[PDB]
């Protein structure tokens, strides 16, 4: 029991036929909100019930309404890794650059959870690759930190900047160097990540890098 609203519990638990009978008899239940300000769409996205999402979209429910934590269906779908539900929400013009209460866009969640296919769909859908959260961090900061080369290639193909500083003054290259993501550091530098930008501790990526990574990155840029 995730909701005080029956159609939401039906949506979460995947009761397509029951949910369809409830809504078709009372079409206002499709947009009725619960204790978390969630509709049946929000809960169907969370649990991954593609066919219930398709039913609710075919009725013409709004697709951009935020719950009490600022989460849109597209935030929920992206984070829970619902590939087909992301696709359906984008087909109905879900807001790709919507922000929740943490300032996170759906692409922030795609990056932070290595959702390659969802990241591509969001970027093809016009997602801003350089969207900054409340700590001024990007998809690229998460991909670089976590050491996800596939995600770095995707973000670079869709023209993500590599030089945006977070509130601690760190670029994705500082994070790659601090987390000792060697191949990620070299890829970022080969594609224009600055070895000169200083974080709030007045450190370049070279000075954060451990081992011999810093001299390797310096040689790549300066010879």
The token pair that represents 100 in the structure block: 């929740």
Q: CB-based contacts of 91: which residues, under 8 Å, 6+ apart?
A: 57
C-alpha to C-alpha distance for 45 and 48, rounded to whole angstroms: 5
Q: How far apart are CA 37 and CA 69, in angstroms?
A: 9
Structure tokens at 73: 């269906």
117 vs 86: CA distance, rounded Å: 10
Question: Is the C-alpha dihedral spanning 18, 19, 23, 28 positive or negative?
Answer: positive
Q: Distance between CA 183 and CA 212 in Å, rounded?
A: 13
Resolution in A: 2.2
Q: How far is CA 52 from CA 27, 200, 210, in A?
A: 14, 48, 50
Question: Measuring CA to CA, which residue among 74, 17, 69, 8 is closest to residue 43?
Answer: 8
Joined together, the tokens standing for residue 19 give 């949910």
CA distance 113 to 82: 12
Give the closest residue to 157 by CA, choosing from 186, 124, 202: 124
Instruction: Write out the DSSP string of 158-211.
Output: TT--S----TTS--HHHHHHHTT-HHHHHHHHHTT--SS---TTS--HHHH--T
Give the C-alpha distances (Å, rounded to integers) separating 171 from 139, 188, 205: 11, 10, 8
* Residue 32 CB neighbour total at 10 angstroms: 15
Backbone φ, ψ for residue 80 (5° rounding): -80, -5
> Residue 17 contacts by C-beta under 8 Å, 6 or more apart in sequence?
none
Characterise 88 by phi-psi region: left (phi > 0), alpha (psi -120 to 50), beta (else). Answer: alpha
Report the C-alpha gap between 56 and 8 in whole angstroms. Answer: 12
Neighbour-count burial for 54-86, b at 16+ CB within 10 Å, e otherwise: bbbbeeebebebbbeeebbbbbbbbbbbbbebb
Question: Do the beta carbons of residue 155 and residue 186 sit within 8 Å?
Answer: no
What CA–CA distance (Å, rounded) separates 153 from 144?
A: 11
- Would you tell me how many other CB atoms lie within 10 Å of the CB of residue 203? 17
Residue 73 to residue 66: CA distance in whole angstroms: 8
Q: Are 9 and 3 in contact (CB under 8 A)?
A: yes
| Helix residue ranges, H only, 34-137 | 40-47, 50-59, 73-80, 83-91, 106-112, 116-124
| 8 Å CB contact between 144 and 115 | no
């Amino acid at each position: 029991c995730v909701s005080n609203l029956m159609v939401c519990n039906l949506a979460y638990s995947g009761k397509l036929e029951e949910l369809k009978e409830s809504i078709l008899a009372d079409k206002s239940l499709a947009t009725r909100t619960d204790q978390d300000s969630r509709t049946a769409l929000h809960w169907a996205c969370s649990a991954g019930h593609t066919e219930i999402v398709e039913f609710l979209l075919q009725l013409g429910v709004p697709v951009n309404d935020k719950d009490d934590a600022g989460w849109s269906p597209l935030h929920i779908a992206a984070s829970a890794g619902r590939d087909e539900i992301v696709k359906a929400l984008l087909g109905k013009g879900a807001q790709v650059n919507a922000v929740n209460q943490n300032g996170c866009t759906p692409l922030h969640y795609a990056a932070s959870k290595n959702r390659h296919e969802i990241a591509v769909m969001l970027l093809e859908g016009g997602a801003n690759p350089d969207a900054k959260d409340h700590y001024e961090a990007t998809a690229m900061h998460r991909a670089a930190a976590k050491g996800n080369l596939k995600m770095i290639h995707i973000l670079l193909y869709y023209k993500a900047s590599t030089n945006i500083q977070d509130t601690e003054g760190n670029t994705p290259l500082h994070l790659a160097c601090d987390e000792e993501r060697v191949e990620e550091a070299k890829l970022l530098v080969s594609q224009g990540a600055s070895i000169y930008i200083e974080n709030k501790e007045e450190k370049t990526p070279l000075q954060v890098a451990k081992g011999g990574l810093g001299l390797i990155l310096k040689r790549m840029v300066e010879g």
